[PDB]
Amino acid sequence: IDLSRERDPNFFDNPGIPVPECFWFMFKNNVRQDDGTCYSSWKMDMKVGPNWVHIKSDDNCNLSGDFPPGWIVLGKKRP
Amino acid sequence: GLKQKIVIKVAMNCRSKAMALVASTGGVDSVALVGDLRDKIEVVGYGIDPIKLISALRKKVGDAELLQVSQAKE
Amino acid sequence: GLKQKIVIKVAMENCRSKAMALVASTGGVDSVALVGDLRDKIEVVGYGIDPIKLISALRKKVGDAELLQVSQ
């Protein structure tokens, strides 16, 4: 898995709220399943295969969460 | 974080119908088709019940799955 | 073919929901966002949106509607 060489997510930034700092990508056995944006130094709840996962973002858009086996979601800088 | 961001996968012209239904919900600031296949609706607003929204979608458009709930932040 | 951003000011007195439904249902629309402090402007993004028909629709079915912006 390599995020430098992942196509930028198809996103829409609501003008009424701050722009999210991070792109994110969801994989099951490294096969990209999903993507979108998120705020860094923040959190979201995401459906990851069968389970809801409370994903934490640090200020470098690194994403920690208790991912089910064979699943991961990875975060990163937006230009 | 008074505003919610909700991402919903919809079996989806179903896009226009799904978009109209969510757009018509109370408290909505924005709806956007997102993802590479444009098979997802991201809604931003206030006082949106995701459960009622998913129910509305399933009875009206077709299969729908809550994917993401997060707050907006200032 | 080109990615268009269109901003329309609409009277809207819950005429907001009807207006957002209409725009959101229009051909080629990717996003609809209420903008301005009073949420009295609709911002539309997409491909192949016809702003003339969109304005006609909004005047016909919601009320006074004004083109503030078209960009791409």
Residue numbers in the entry:
A (entry chain CCC): 33 to 111
B (entry chain BBB): 186 to 197, 201 to 262
C (entry chain AAA): 186 to 198, 201 to 259
Excerpt from the publication:
The rice NLR pair Pik-1/Pik-2 recognizes AVR-Pik effectors from the blast fungus Magnaporthe oryzae, triggering immune responses that limit rice blast infection. The sensor NLR Pik-1 harbours an integrated heavy metal associated (HMA) domain that directly binds AVR-Pik triggering immune responses. Allelic variation in a heavy metal associated (HMA) domain integrated in the receptor Pik-1 confers differential binding to AVR-Pik variants, determining resistance specificity. AVR-Pik is one of the several rice blast effectors characterized to date, and belongs to the Magnaporthe AVRs and ToxB like (MAX) effector family, whose members share a similar overall structural scaffold despite divergent sequence.
Based on the structures of Pikm-HMA with AVR-Pik variants, we previously identified a mutant of Pikp, named PikpNK-KE, that extended binding and recognition of this NLR. Interestingly, the Asn261Lys polymorphism found in Pikh is the same as the first position of this double mutant. As previously reported, Pikp-HMANK-KE showed increased binding to all the AVR-Pik effectors compared with Pikp-HMA, including to AVR-PikC. Overall, the binding levels of Pikp-HMANK-KE to each of the AVR-Pik effectors were very similar to Pikh-HMA. Furthermore, the side-by-side comparison of responses in N. benthamiana showed that the additional mutation Lys262Glu in the engineered receptor PikpNK-KE contributes to enhance responses, without affecting the strength of binding to the AVR-Pik effector. Previous structural studies showed that the side chain of Glu262 is directed away from the binding interface with the effector, and would not be expected to influence interaction directly. Therefore, Lys262Glu may affect the activation of Pikp-1NK-KE through a mechanism downstream of effector binding. AVR-PikC differs from AVR-PikE by a single polymorphism, Ala67Asp. Further modifications, using PikpNK-KE or Pikh as a scaffold, could further increase binding affinity of the Pik-HMA for AVR-PikC to a sufficient level to confer resistance in rice.
